[PDB]
Coordinates of C-alpha atoms in Angstrom, one line a residue:
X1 CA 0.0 0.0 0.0
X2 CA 2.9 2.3 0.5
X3 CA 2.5 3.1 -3.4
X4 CA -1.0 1.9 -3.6
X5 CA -2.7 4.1 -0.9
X6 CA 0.3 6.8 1.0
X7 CA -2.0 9.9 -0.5
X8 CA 0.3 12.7 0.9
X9 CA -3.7 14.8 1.3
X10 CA -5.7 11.6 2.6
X11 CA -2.4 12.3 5.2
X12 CA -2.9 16.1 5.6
X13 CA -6.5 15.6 6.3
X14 CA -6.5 13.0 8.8
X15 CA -4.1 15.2 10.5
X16 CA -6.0 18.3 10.6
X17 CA -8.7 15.5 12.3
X18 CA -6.5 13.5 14.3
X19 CA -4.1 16.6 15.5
X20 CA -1.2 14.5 17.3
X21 CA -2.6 11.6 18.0
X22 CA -2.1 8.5 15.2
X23 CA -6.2 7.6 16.0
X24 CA -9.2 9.4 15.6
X25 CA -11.2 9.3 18.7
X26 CA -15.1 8.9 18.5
X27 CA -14.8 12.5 20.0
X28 CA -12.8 13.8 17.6
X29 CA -14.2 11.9 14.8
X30 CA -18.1 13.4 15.4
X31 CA -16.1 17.2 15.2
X32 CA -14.4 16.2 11.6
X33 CA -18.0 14.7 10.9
X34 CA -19.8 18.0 11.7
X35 CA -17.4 20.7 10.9
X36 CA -15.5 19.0 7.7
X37 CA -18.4 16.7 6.1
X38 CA -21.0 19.1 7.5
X39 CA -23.6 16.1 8.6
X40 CA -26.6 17.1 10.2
X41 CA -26.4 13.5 12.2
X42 CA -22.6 14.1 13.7
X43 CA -22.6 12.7 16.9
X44 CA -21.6 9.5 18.9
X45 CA -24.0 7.4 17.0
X46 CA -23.0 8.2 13.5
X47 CA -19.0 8.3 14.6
X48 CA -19.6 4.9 16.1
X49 CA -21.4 3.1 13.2
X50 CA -18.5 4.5 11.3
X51 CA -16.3 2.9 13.1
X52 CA -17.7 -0.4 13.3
X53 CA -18.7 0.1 9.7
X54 CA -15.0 1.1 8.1
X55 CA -12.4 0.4 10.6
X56 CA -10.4 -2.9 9.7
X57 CA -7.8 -2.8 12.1
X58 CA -10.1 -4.6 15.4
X59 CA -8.2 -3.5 18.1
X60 CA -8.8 0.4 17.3
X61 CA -12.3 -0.5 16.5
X62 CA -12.2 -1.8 20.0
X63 CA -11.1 1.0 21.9
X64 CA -13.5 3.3 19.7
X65 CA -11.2 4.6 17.2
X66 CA -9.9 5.4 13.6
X67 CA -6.8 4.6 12.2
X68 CA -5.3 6.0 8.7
X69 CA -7.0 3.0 7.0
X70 CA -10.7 3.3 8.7
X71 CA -10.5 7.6 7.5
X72 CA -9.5 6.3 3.8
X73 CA -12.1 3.5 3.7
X74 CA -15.0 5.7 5.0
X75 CA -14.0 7.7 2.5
X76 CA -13.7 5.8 -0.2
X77 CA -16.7 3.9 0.8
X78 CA -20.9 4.7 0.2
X79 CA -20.9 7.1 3.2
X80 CA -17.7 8.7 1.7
X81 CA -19.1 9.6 -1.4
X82 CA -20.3 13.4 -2.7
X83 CA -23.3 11.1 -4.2
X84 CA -26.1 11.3 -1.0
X85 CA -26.3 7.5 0.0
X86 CA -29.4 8.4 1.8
X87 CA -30.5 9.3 -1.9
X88 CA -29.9 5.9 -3.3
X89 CA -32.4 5.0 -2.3
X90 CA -36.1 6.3 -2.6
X91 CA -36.8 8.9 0.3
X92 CA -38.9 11.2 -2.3
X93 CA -43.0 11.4 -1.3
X94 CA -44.1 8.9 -4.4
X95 CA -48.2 10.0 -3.7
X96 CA -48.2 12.9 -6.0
X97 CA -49.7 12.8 -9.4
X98 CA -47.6 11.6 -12.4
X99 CA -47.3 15.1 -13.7
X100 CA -45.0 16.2 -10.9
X101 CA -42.0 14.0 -11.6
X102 CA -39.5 14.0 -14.0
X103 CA -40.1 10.4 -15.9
X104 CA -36.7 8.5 -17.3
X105 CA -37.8 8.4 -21.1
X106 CA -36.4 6.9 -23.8
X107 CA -37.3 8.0 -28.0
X108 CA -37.2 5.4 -30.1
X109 CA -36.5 2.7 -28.0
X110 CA -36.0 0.2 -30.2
X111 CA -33.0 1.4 -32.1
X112 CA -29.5 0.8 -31.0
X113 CA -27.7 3.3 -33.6
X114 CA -28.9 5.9 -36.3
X115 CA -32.7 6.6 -37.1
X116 CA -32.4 5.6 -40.6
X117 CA -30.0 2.4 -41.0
X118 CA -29.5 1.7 -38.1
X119 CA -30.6 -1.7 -36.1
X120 CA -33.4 -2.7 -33.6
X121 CA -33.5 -4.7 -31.4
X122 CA -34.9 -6.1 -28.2
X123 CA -31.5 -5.3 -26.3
X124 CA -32.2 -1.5 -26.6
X125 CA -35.7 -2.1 -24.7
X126 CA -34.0 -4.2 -21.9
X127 CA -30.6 -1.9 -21.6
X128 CA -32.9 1.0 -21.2
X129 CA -34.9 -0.5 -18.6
X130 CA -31.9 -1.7 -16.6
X131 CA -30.8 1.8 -16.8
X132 CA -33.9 2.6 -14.8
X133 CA -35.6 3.7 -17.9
X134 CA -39.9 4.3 -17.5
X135 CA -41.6 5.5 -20.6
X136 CA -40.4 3.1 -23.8
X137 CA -41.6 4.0 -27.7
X138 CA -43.1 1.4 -29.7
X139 CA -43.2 2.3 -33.8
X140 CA -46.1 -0.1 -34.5
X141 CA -46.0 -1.5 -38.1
X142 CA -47.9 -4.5 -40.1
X143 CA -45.4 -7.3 -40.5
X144 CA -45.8 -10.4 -42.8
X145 CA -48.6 -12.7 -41.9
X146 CA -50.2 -10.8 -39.7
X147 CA -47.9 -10.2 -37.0
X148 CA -47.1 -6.5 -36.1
X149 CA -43.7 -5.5 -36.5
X150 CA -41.4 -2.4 -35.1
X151 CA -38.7 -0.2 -36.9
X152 CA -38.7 3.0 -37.9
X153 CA -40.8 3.5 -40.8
X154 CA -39.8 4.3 -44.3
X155 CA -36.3 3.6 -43.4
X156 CA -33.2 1.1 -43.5
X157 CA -33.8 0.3 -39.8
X158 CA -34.0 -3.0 -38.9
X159 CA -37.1 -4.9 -38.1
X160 CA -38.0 -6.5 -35.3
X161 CA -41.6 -8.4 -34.0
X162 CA -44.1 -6.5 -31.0
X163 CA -43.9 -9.5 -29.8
X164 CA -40.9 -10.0 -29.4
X165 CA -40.2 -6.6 -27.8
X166 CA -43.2 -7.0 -25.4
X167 CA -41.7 -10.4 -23.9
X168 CA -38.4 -8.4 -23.1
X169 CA -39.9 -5.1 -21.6
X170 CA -42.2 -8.3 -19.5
X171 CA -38.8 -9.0 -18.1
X172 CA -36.6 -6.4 -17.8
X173 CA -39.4 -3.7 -17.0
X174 CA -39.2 -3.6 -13.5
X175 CA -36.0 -5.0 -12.5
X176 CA -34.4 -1.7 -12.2
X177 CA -37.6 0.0 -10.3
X178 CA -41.0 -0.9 -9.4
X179 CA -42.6 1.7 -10.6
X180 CA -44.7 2.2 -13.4
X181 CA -43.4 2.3 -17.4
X182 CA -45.3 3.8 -19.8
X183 CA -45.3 2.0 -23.2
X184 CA -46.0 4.6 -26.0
X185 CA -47.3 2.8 -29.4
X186 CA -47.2 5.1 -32.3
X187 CA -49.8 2.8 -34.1
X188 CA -49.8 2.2 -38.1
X189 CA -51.0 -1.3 -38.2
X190 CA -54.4 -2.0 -39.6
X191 CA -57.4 -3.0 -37.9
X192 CA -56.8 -6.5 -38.0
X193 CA -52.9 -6.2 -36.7
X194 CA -53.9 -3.7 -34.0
X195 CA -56.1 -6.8 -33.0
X196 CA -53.1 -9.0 -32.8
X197 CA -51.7 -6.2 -31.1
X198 CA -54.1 -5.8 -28.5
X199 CA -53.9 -10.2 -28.1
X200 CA -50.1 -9.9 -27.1
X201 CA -50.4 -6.6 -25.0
X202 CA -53.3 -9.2 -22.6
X203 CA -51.2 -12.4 -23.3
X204 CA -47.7 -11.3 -22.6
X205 CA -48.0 -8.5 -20.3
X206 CA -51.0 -10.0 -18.4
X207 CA -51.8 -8.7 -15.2
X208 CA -49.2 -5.9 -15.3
X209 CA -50.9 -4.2 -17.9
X210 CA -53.3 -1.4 -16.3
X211 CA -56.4 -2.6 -18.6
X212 CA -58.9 -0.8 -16.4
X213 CA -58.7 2.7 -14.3
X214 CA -58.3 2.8 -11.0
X215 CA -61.6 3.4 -8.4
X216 CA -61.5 7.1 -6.9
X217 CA -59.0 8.5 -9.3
X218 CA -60.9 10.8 -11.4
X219 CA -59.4 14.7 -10.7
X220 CA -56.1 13.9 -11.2
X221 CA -53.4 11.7 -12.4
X222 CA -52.5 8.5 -10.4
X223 CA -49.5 8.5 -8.5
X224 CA -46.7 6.4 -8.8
X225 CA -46.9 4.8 -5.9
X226 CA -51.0 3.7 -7.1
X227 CA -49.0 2.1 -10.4
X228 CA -46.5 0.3 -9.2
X229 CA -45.4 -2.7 -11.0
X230 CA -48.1 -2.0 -13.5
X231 CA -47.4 -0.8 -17.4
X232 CA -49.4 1.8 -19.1
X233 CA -50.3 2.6 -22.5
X234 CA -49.9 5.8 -24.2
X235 CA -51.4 7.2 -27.5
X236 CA -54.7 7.6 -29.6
X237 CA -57.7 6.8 -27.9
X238 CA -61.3 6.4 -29.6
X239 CA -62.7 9.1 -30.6
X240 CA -65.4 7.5 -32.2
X241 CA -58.6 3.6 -38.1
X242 CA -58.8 2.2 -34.2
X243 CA -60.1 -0.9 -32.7
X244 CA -61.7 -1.1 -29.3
X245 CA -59.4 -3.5 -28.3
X246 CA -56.6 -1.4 -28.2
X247 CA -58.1 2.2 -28.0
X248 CA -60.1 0.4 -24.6
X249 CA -56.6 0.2 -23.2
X250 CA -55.2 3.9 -23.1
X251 CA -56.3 4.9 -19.8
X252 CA -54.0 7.5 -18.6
X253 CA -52.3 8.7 -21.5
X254 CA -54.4 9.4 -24.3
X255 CA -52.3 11.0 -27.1
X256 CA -53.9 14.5 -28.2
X257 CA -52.8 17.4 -30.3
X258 CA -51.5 20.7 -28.5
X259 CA -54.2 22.9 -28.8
X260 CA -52.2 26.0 -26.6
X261 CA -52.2 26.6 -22.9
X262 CA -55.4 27.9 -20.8
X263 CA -54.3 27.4 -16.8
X264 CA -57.2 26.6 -14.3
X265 CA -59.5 29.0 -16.0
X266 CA -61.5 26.3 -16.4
X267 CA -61.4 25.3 -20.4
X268 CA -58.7 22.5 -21.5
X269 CA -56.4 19.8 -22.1
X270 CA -57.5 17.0 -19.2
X271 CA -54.9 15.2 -17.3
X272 CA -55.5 11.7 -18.5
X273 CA -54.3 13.5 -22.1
X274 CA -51.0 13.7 -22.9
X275 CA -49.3 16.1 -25.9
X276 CA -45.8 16.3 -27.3
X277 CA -43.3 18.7 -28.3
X278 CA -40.4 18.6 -30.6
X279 CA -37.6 20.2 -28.8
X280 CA -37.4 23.4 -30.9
X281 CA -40.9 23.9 -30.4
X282 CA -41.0 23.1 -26.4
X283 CA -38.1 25.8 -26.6
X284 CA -40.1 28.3 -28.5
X285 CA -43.2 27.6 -25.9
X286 CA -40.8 28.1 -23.2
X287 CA -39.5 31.2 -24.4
X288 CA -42.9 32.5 -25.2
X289 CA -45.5 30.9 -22.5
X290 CA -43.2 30.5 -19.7
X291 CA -44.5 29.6 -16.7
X292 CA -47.8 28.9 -19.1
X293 CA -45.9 25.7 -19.5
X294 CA -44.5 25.2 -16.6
X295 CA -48.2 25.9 -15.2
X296 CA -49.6 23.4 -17.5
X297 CA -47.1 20.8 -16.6
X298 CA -48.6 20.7 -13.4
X299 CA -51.3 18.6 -14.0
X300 CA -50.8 16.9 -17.4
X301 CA -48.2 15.3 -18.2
X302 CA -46.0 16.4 -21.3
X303 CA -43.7 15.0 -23.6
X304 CA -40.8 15.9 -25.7
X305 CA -38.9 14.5 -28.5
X306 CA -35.6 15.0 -30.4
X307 CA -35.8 17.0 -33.6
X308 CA -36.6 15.2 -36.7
X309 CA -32.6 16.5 -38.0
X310 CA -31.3 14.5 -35.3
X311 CA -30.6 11.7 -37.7
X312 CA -27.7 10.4 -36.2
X313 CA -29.5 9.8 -32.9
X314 CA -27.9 12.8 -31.3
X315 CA -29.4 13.8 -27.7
X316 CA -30.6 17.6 -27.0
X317 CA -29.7 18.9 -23.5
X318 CA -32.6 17.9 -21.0
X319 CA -32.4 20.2 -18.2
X320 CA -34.2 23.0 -19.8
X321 CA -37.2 21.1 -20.6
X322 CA -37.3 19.7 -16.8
X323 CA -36.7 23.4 -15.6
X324 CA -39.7 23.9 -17.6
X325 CA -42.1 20.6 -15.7
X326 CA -41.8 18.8 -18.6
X327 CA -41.8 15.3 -17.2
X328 CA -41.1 13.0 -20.3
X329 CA -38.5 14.7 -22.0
X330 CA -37.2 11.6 -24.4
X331 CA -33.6 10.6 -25.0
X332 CA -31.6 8.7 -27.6
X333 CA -30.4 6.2 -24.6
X334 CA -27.9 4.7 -26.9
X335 CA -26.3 7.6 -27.3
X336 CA -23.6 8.4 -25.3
X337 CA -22.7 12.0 -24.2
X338 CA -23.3 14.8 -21.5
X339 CA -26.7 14.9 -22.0
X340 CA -27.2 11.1 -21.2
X341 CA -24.4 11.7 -18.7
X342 CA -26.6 14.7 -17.2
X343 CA -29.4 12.6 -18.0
X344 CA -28.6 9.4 -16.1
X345 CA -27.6 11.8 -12.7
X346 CA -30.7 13.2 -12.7
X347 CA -31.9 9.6 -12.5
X348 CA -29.5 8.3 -9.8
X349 CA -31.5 10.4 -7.8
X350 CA -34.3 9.3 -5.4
X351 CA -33.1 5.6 -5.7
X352 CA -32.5 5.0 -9.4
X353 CA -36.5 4.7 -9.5
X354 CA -36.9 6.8 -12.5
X355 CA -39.5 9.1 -11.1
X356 CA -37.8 12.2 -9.6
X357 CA -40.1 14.4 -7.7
X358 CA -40.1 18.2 -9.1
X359 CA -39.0 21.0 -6.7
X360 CA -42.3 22.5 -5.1
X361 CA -42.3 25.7 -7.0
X362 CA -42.9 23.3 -10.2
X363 CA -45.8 21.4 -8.4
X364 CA -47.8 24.6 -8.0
X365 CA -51.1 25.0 -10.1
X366 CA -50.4 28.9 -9.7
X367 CA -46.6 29.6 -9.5
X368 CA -45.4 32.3 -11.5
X369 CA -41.9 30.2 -11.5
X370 CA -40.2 31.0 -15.3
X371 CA -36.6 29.7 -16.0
X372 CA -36.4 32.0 -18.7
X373 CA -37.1 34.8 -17.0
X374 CA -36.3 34.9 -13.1
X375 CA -37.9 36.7 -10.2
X376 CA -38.0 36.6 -6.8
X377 CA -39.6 33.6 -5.1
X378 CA -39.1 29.8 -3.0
X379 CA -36.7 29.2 -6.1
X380 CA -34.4 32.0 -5.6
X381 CA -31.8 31.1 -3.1
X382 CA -28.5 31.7 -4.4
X383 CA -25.8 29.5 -2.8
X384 CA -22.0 29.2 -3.1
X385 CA -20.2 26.2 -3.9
X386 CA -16.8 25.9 -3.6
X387 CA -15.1 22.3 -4.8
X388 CA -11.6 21.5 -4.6
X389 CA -10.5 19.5 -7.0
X390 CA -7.8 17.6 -4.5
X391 CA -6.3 14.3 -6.3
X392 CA -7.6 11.8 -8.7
X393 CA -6.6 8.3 -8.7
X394 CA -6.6 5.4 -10.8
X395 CA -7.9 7.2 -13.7
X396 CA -9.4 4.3 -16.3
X397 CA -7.3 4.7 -19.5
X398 CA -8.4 2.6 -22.7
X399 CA -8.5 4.1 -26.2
X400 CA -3.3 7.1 -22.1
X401 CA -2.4 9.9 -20.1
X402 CA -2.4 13.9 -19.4
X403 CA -5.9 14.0 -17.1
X404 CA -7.6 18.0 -16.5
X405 CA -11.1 18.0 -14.4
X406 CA -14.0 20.2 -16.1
X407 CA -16.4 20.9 -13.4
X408 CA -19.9 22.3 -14.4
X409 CA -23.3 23.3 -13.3
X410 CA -26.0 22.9 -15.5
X411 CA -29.2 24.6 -14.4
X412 CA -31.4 27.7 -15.0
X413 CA -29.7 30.0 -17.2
X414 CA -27.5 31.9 -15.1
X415 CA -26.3 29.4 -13.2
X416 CA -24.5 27.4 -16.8
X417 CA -21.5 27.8 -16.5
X418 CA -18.0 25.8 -16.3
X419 CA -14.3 25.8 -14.9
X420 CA -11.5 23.6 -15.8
X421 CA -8.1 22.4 -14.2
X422 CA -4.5 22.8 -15.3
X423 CA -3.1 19.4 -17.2
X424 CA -1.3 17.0 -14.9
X425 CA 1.2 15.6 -17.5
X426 CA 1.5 11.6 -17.4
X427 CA -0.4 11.1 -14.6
X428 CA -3.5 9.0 -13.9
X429 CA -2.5 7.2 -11.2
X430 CA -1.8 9.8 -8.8
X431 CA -2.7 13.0 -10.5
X432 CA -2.7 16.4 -7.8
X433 CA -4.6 19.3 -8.7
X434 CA -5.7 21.4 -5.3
X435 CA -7.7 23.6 -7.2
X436 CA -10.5 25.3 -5.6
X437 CA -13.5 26.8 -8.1
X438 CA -16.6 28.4 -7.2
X439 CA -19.8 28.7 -8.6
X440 CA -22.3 31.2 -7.8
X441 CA -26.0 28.8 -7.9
X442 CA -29.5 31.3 -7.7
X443 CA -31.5 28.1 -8.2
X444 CA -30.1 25.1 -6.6
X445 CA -33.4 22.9 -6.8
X446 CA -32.9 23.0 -10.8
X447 CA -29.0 22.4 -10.5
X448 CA -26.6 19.6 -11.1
X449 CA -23.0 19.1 -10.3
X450 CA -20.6 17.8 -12.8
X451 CA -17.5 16.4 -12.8
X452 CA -15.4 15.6 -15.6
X453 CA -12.4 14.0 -16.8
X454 CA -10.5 14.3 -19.4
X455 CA -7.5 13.3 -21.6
X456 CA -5.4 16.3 -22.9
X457 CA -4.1 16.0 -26.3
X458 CA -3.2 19.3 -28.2
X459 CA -3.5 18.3 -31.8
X460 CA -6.3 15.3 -31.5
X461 CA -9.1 16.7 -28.9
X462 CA -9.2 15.6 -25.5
X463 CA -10.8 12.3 -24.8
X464 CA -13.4 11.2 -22.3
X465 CA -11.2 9.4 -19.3
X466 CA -14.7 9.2 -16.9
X467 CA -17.3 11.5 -15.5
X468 CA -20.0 11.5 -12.8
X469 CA -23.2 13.9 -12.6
X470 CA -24.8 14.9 -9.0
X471 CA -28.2 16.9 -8.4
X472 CA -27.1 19.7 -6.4
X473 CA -29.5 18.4 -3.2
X474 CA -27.5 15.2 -3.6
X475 CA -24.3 16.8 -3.5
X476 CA -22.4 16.1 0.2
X477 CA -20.0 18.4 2.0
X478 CA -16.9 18.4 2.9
X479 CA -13.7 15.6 2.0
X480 CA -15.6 13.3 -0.5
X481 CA -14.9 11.1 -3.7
X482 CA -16.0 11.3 -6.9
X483 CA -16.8 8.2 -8.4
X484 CA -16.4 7.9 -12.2
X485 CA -18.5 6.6 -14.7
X486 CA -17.5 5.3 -18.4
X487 CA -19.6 6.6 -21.6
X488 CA -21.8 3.8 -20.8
X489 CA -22.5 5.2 -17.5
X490 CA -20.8 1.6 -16.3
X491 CA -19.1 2.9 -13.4
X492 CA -15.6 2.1 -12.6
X493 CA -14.4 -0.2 -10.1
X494 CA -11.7 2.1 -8.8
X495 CA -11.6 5.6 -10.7
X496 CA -12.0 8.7 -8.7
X497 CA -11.5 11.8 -8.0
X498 CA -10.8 13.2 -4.5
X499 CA -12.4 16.1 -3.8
X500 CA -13.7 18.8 -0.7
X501 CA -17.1 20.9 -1.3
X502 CA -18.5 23.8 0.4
X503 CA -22.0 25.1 0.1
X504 CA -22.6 28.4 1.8
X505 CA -25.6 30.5 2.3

């Protein structure tokens, strides 16, 4: 370990902790644990489980106290991280009507690649849902010998059987989380496939599938907690080219056309009806209706799309959709990037469940909240975070070398905005930075953390060593690691980044 571990700061620190002594008493462990890593819980009891929890030498953890080894371990381990481990897993109220979280949703589920070429398959349905993944997309199509088929249409895409894809999402759908996922069909199959349709939707997904409402919800959107391990379909309902069969089965999402905001002034789009948005257009609403939207997002669920040029599968950024309510804001999952990275940490949040409860101010019928346009209100509480980017250490490295650390807030408007280390050349093992930034956050609710690492090369373009994305309510205090994600979001087994972070009023 004396290469391995022997991190001149994990030293410095457990100093300024220890003082003189070579062990951390449980008294002056609970001081580091309130003053350094800021936790509301310091005391005996927290110090103690810590002990018992990280120490490996016994005899210290016998006479209540914490070695070198018990300080690196703790923070190294869950309770070390900046990630919240109280936040893995789900604390958030799940009563609230579907419209006030933020739904993991996936476009075009099916593909693994481009939107025009590319292949389906049922491994894009079941990676998505293992990635915690709620609302897939089913482009319904009639297939030879009456069995419906999926790909996207008038294309080179690959073809693949409902079927098939329904036995997968039976699965895989919730392994991840046991709350609801919303299948939306985009329906183009005749009467007599949409029959075969409906057949496979009762045969494969049985009882999962919500086939009937539920008794007493009639105002308002279920809540996740009312749906749990249950699937829901999504798009046209009979108005009256459908069958009953299948029309009969779109309870809670009927798809309808946007026909413009209205607010409670009683005349409107209900909240079993569900419209979507190409995201140029949910941008122009959001630069023009404001909190219209965000208003409207309250109650009815709404979702949004990447723009038809996005060919090549490429992902728009999702954060100003969500600052905006917009609950299903769908993602090209197989392609990797900061906006799946930022994606995916959204999503870490409240235990990987894929329903993220909106901040307060976006769960008001009557909240004149606009992130386009900020005033005063509940939202506006401008913090301070400080992060020191200390050391990293055991950087992954598979195309390696030179690492720098962006770090970046993504947000409202104001608070975008970025700062970058200096290059440690040829170093990934033990690279040192002890740099300090600071960020200057208005609207923390609406805020995310990011940290990322990258491989300098002048004349070539950095590449993507390993990041890791943290809602700003998730984001710990004081000496914490980083742990480091691949492109995949895979994280890995022993990249991080050691860092201290300071949040002040």
């Amino acid at each position: 370990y004396k290469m391995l571990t022997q991190r001149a700061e994990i030293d410095r620190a457990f100093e300024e902790a220890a003082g003189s002594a070579e062990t951390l008493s449980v008294e002056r462990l609970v001081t580091f644990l309130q003053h350094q890593q800021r936790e509301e819980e310091a005391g005996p009891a927290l110090a103690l489980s810590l002990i018992e929890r990280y120490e490996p030498s016994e005899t210290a953890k016998a006479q209540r106290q914490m070695t070198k080894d018990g300080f690196l371990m703790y923070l190294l381990s869950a309770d070390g991280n900046a990630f919240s481990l109280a936040h893995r897993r789900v604390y958030q109220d799940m009563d609230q009507p579907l419209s006030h979280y933020l739904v993991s949703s996936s476009h075009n589920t099916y593909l693994l690649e481009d939107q025009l070429t590319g292949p389906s398959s049922t491994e894009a349905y079941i990676r998505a849902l293992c990635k915690g993944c709620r609302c897939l997309e089913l482009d319904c199509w009639d297939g030879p010998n009456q069995e419906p088929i999926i790909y996207h249409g008038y294309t080179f895409t690959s073809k693949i059987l409902f079927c098939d894809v329904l036995r997968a999402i039976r699965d895989y759908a919730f392994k991840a989380s046991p709350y609801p996922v919303i299948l939306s069909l985009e329906n183009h199959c005749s009467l007599e496939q949409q029959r075969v349709m409906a057949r496979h939707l009762r045969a494969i997904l049985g009882p999962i599938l919500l086939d009937q409402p539920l008794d007493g919800v009639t105002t308002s959107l279920p809540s996740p907690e009312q749906l749990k391990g249950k699937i829901l379909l999504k798009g046209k309902k009979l108005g009256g080219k459908l069958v009953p069969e299948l029309s009969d089965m779109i309870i809670y999402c009927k798809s309808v056309h946007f026909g413009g905001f209205s607010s409670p002034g009683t005349s409107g789009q209900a909240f079993y009806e569900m419209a979507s948005f190409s995201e140029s257009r949910a941008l122009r609403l959001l630069q023009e209706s404001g909190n219209g939207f965000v208003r409207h997002n309250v109650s009815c669920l709404s979702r949004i799309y990447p723009a038809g040029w996005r060919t090549d599968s490429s992902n728009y950024s999702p954060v100003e959709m969500w600052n905006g309510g917009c609950q299903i804001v769908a993602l090209n999952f197989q392609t990797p990037g900061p906006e799946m990275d930022v994606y995916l940490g959204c999503f870490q949040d409240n235990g990987g469940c894929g329903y993220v409860l909106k901040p307060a101010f976006l769960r008001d019928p009557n909240t004149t909240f606009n992130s386009r346009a900020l005033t005063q209100g509940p939202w506006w509480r401008p913090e301070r975070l400080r992060v020191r980017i200390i050391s990293g250490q055991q950087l992954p490295k598979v195309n390696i070398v030179d690492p720098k650390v962006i770090v970046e807030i993504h947000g409202v408007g104001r608070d975008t905005g970025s700062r970058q280390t200096a290059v440690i050349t040829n170093n990934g093992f033990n690279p040192r930075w002890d740099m300090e930034f600071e960020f200057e956050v208005t609207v923390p609710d609406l805020a995310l953390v990011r940290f990322m690492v990258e491989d300098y090369d002048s004349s070539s373009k950095n590449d993507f060593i390993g990041q890791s994305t943290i809602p700003w309510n998730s984001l710990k205090q004081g000496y914490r690691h980083v742990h480091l994600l691949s492109k995949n979001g895979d994280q890995h087994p022993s990249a991080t980044l050691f860092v201290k972070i300071s949040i002040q009023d």
